[PDB]
């Protein structure tokens, strides 16, 4: 009785690509949020976290491909690649500082960098969330 398989919409497929990569974006957002939390007492916990961010970023940036060709709206599809493009720089910067503090926990500036970075990438991941949900569903 009218289902998205018998009669599907263009953006009706984007719903999966949207939801899938936002999950990863939220996962990244909590990972970076752990990075700032851990770095108080735990600079070694930042080892798996840096790998974690690195790993899931690859997935997020990857789903940017099938999502862009699924998004019926130009801007939605465009912003997808743009935000993960930005994230590629920010996440790499973060994991570098995470690995640096991981070596020297006594250095406050290394940690400061990470703190300044995490809050920003948590926004940049939110921009994937926002770009995708521009259709509002």
Swiss-Prot record:
Region annotated Helical bundle R10, chain positions: 7-137
Compartments, record wording: Cell projection, Ruffle membrane; Cytoplasm, Cytoskeleton; Cell surface; Cell junction, Focal adhesion
Disulfide bonding pattern of the chain: none
Phosphoserine: residues carrying this PTM: 13, 42
Residues recorded with modification Phosphothreonine: 19
Comment text on domains: Consists of an N-terminal FERM domain linked via a short unstructured region to a large flexible C-terminal rod which contains 13 amphipathic helical bundles (R1-R13). The rod begins with a five-helix bundle (R1) followed by three four-helix bundles (R2-R4). These are followed by a series of eight five-helix bundles (R5-R7 and R9-R13) in which the N- and C-termini are positioned at opposite ends of the bundle, creating a linear chain. The four-helix bundle R8 does not disrupt the chain because it is inserted into a loop in the R7 five-helix bundle.
Function: High molecular weight cytoskeletal protein concentrated at regions of cell-matrix and cell-cell contacts. Involved in connections of major cytoskeletal structures to the plasma membrane. With KANK1 co-organize the assembly of cortical microtubule stabilizing complexes (CMSCs) positioned to control microtubule-actin crosstalk at focal adhesions (FAs) rims.
Assembly, per entry: Part of a complex composed of THSD1, PTK2/FAK1, TLN1 and VCL. Interacts with THSD1; this promotes interaction with PTK2/FAK1 and VCL. Interacts with NRAP and LAYN. Interacts with SYNM. Interacts with ITGB1; the interaction is prevented by competitive binding of ITGB1BP1. Binds with high affinity to VCL and with low affinity to integrins. Interacts with APBB1IP; this inhibits VCL binding. Interacts with PTK2/FAK1. Interacts with PIP5K1C. Interacts with F-actin. Interacts with SVEP1.
Official protein name in the record: Talin-1
The species this protein was found in: Mus musculus (Mouse)
Gene label: Tln1
């Amino acid at each position: 009785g009218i289902d998205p398989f018998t009669m599907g919409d263009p953006e009706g497929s984007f719903v999966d690509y949207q939801t899938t990569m936002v999950r990863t974006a939220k996962a990244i957002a909590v990972t970076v949020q752990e990075m700032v939390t851990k770095s108080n007492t735990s600079p070694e916990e930042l080892g798996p976290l840096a790998n974690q961010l690195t790993s899931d970023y690859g997935r997020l940036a990857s789903q940017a491909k099938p999502a862009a060709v699924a998004a019926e709206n130009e801007e939605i599809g465009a912003h997808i690649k743009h935000r993960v493009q930005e994230l590629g720089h920010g996440c790499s910067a973060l994991v570098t500082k995470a690995g640096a503090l991981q070596c020297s926990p006594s250095d406050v500036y290394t940690k400061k960098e990470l703190i300044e970075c995490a809050r920003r990438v948590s926004e940049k991941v939110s921009h994937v969330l926002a770009a995708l949900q521009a259709g509002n569903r």
